[PDB]
Amino acid sequence: VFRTRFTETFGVEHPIMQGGMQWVGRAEMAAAVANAGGLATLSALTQPSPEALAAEIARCRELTDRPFGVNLTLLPTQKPVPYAEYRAAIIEAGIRVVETAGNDPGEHIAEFRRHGVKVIHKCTAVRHALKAERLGVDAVSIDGFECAGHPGEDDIPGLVLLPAAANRLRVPIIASGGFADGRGLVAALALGADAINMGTRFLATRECPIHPAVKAAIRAADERSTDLIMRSLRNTARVARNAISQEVLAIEARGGAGYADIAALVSGQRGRQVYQQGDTDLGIWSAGMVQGLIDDEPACAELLRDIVEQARQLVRQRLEGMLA
């Protein structure tokens, strides 16, 4: 339906991407998005070891014959993280595209390029995207203030950040954060982007391998139900509002709050159970404010189909109509 710099550069049918999703980005999710015509990703760090990632990549290929990428998120944890070995695993497996995210991606980006692996780098500010462009990325994913996950500390929504980035970048641009339907796609394209990336919208799909109660919570939540935790630590993260996030905010509000004071609460182990058990209060889990626009649970195939079909109709019906 839509042909853009994104679809041509990455060889996918639709200008829609399913980026990094810790715990969630498993074979089932990626295959579904890949089979749906979009650019999918397996979460590298969701797999406990490089070897596990190799096994997951093979498992995903059993569910889809279409190409898919891998997300390599650069966690700030000072704990043993064999990124190099993970990269090696991703490369050896023949992955053609990788989505990097986090701080100082230089080292990894360069390596992937040396082996013919295209790199999409997700960043939260124009200055970061430029630095990445100078590093040689194939595309930049501009993540706005609306996004689930880490939006950085500038607090600039996509409506402004996107055109500000388009004003300076040359490589393809992927709008990320706050998108869920065709209206968002057109808006993103009009603002200078060539595709949209979504996370929360994919949680609310049939194939997303998470407990049904989590999918139900996204559907019930309005746009005002997310919290920004760890702002006082300059490690801001937008997560689903729950007893846990509210607690960490109370701790930060008290003053003199260190990571060790909340570590147990923001535990990834504790957060991974939300998805497997369905206990939305067990721990911290990522969700964007765009949840307020979501209230259904389609199969990925129809979702992507409907988004581009909705977008096309907005152009030829609504927009062209106003010009007629």
Ligand SMILES: Cc1cc2nc3c(=O)[nH]c(=O)nc-3n(C[C@H](O)[C@H](O)[C@H](O)COP(=O)(O)O)c2cc1C
């Ligand atoms: C459950 C969940 C887990 C996520 N995990 C990661 C991750 O590990 N690394 C990363 O770079 N982004 C991660 N993200 C962010 C998404 O890739 C994307 O940038 C963001 O969801 C866009 O905002 P949206 O939720 O409004 O679509 C996650 C998002 C969700 C909803």
